[PDB]
């Protein structure tokens, strides 16, 4: 059990580093509080499919109840971090 | 009024959560899909077809309607993971036969009577 | 009645009526009409609300014992509300008898599933499913049973054209067999067979 | 727990095996799907008649003989005595061809081959027979709902009467080679056992009832044309396995021997199709010497006989069981709706319970002891 | 006493006059908590209590079988469960109610 812990820093690291990703988000518009919406033109398939992604990426399931509600990269941090049990 | 008895969903909301699961899962199956049939097309376009089918629906706005479509997407989703489809039957999808019909006035002029 | 007429039985005509009259009292809440036909075939139009019920009580109830289910399909009509009759036969072994119970549906409205009541209705289900477009609740694995695998339409529909909408052949450039849309080499001819001057009139209808 | 496909009468079969034991199989059909229901209300009823040949093609007149009927009682009109006899015959014949050819398919696939040479032999007698009443070997439309289309030529009766009288030593020499022997026995007992109860409760008939020993046969408890004017016994099983399936089909071959012997002694004299030409079509001669039997001639192969509105479910038992119609009549000279009740489709819907804890050298066993054939099942 | 009441399944039963008995009892029973003007209720104890008669009037299984009219007293048996379970499923669907709606206007009207 010598590996480094998850951070924050590198949650989100990892987080924007799949956002730069996928092909329909320039990396010059996303910020980690764009709104996939409004800010950055997606609909529900296209949340769908980043919450693919970040299940793939983060190596477990999120129910759809509560994957529907992240709907800006920082939530989705604070949602990775709360299901991973962090401090910084 | 006009009181219906439902099939799955008392509204929109729960049809729409159904009609993402099943999206879900037909995303998920795209590249074993791809790899078990030996197809000579991409994940990418196969699940841009996947995309273009679930769009076709998208100007549904009744609850019975789109869980029927979403018991129909899943009895063919079903079929394609059991392999019971061919390869004819998922190249199906795709027309790649069909020889390309113009939608302009005047070529459908040209061709013959057909508006 | 000379040797060219077919006889008629009145014993079994009373008989099923009578039994008619006892089903309708004992089930008041989902019979609705009960009919005995002139060559002695009693049928039980019901609510479809109570498919299970119904079904359950002529399978199990003393007096009926309707242990077999003979057959299991749909008809379309497609000038009323409810597009779809659904007809159950039953076969009764105990007292050497046969019923049919009926019942309508929609394209959109579920039917309750009798394979609890009898095992021999999945696929029948199955079928009608296939061919009529109405679903089954509760189920146990309801798909298509008869049509191509991703055949799309109900074929037994009135308004489902008699070829279909595609068909098949082997394409050499892509080495495999491709569907598409039909186009036949001597169109099939229909006929205006039916003739004015009506047949029968005992079947008239009021001129409204 | 591995997945075999066993596909391409025809029939694919999926079924999950662990070890040699299967523990499911699920069947999967529509190979010969040819939507012959729909196909039907394009037809007038004369028309539609030779569907029915089509639909089981080893008993063609027994599925002509369910159509006449239900087609009779929606017109309300009765076939006179002598086609009457004449379609029991001629039924009971279609009976013996289906056993035959079901025993011996059973045998062949288990392995026997040699009785399917010796008694297609006879097969081939009995489709001379069809052939000299109907000029076709086996699709025939010989049984019309107004009686049968021509009466019997000359010297029919004494070569089937020479025929018939050869036949018990043919299905003796079956039984020598196949009911004691320790093989076959070992292949067919205790295998694929129903019970009575689950019998009825999955829609079986026929055979699939009487080996588990239900006493039902349709033609002792619903008599159709002269049945109930000939004697003959019901085999019964007892354990309700496929050695008692055969035993019964055999004793059914015989009894249909016992039949056809009485049919060729009491056959009557007269006409053979309803004398009604609103109905049956007149004869030749009528037809080119009278005015009305030249209209009626005209609009009986034009337009078709008009059948007033109503529905029948009618049932007979064919060699495969009960078999049956669902015919809708909209009062038009072409059905509305007609619905086919194929015993082999319910009896293929329970292979899957049937076949639960056997090997996998069991299903075509009891693949044979169901006795399939898929133009009825699929049609 | 006989063996291989001749159905696949259908075990012999020793001493079916107690089971039958019995079972009627049950039906009794659960018919008791039926209402009295539904007309499921009168019809089966009326067939019941003719039954449980029979059954009381004769100690014999073979002229009970035949008196009984159901033949084989194990199917009768069998029919007798049924009964029961028919009686418990039937009080739970209470369906000597009032009919739950009418069809459309021309819902059975054939032809056309
Ligand atoms: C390889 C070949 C694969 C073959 C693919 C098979 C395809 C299966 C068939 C598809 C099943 C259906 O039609 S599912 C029925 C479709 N559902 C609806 O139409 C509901 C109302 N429409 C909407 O909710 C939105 O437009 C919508 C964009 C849909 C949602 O996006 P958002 O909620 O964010 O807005």
Known sequence: SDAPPLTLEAIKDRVLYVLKLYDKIDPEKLSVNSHFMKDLGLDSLDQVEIIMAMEDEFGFEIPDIDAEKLMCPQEIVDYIADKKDVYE | GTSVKPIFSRDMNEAKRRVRELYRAWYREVPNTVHLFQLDISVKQGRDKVREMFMKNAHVTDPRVVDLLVIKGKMELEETINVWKQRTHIMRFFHETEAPRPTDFLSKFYVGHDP | TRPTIRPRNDVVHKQLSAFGQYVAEILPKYVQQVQVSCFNELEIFIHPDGVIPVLTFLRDHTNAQFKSLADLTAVDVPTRQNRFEIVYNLLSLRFNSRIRVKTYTDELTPIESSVTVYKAANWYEREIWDMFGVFFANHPDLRRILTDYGFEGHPFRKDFPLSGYVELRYDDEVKRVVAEPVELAQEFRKFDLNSPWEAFPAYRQPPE | ?379 | LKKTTGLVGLAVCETPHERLKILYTKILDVLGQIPKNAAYRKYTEQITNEKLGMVKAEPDVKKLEEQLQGGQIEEVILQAENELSLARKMLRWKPWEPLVEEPPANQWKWPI
């Open chain 4, 1 to 379: 727990n591995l997945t075999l496909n066993f596909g391409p009468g025809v029939l694919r079969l999926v079924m999950e095996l662990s070890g040699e034991m299967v523990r499911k199989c699920d069947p999967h059909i529509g190979l010969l799907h040819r939507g012959t229901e729909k196909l039907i209300e394009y037809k007038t009823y004369l028309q539609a008649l030779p569907y029915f040949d089509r639909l089981d093609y080893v008993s063609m007149m027994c599925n002509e003989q369910a159509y006449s009927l239900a087609v009779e009682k929606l017109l309300n009109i009765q076939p006179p005595p002598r086609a009457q006899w004449i379609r029991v015959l001629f039924g009971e014949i279609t009976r013996l061809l289906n056993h035959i050819m079901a025993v011996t398919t059973h045998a062949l696939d288990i392995g026997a081959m040699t009785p399917f040479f010796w008694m297609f032999e006879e097969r081939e007698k009995m489709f001379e027979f069809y052939e000299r009443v109907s000029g076709a070997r086996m699709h025939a439309a010989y049984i019309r709902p107004g009686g049968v289309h021509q009466d019997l030529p000359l010297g029919l009766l004494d070569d089937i009467y020479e025929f018939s009288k050869n036949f018990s030593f043919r299905i003796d020499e079956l039984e020598e080679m196949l009911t004691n022997n320790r093989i076959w026995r070992n292949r067919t007992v205790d295998i694929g056992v129903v019970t009575a109860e689950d019998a009825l409760n999955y829609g079986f008939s026929g055979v699939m009832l009487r080996g588990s020993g239900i006493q039902w046969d349709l033609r002792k408890t619903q008599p159709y044309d002269v049945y109930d004017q000939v004697e003959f016994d019901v085999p019964i099983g007892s354990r309700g396995d496929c050695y008692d399936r055969y035993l019964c089909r055999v004793e059914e071959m015989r009894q249909s021997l016992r039949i056809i012997s009485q049919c060729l002694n009491k056959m009557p004299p007269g006409e053979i199709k309803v004398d009604d030409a609103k109905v049956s079509p007149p004869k030749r001669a009528e037809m080119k010497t009278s005015m009305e039997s030249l209209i009626h001639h005209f609009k009986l192969y034009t337009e078709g006989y008009q059948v007033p509105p109503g529905a029948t479910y009618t049932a007979i038992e064919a060699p495969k069981g009960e078999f049956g119609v669902y015919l809708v009549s909209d009062g038009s000279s072409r059905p509305y709706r007609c619905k086919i009740k194929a015993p082999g489709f319910a009896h293929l819907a329970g292979l899957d319970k049937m076949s639960k804890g056997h090997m996998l050298a069991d299903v075509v066993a009891i693949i044979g002891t169901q006795d399939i054939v898929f133009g009825e099942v699929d049609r």
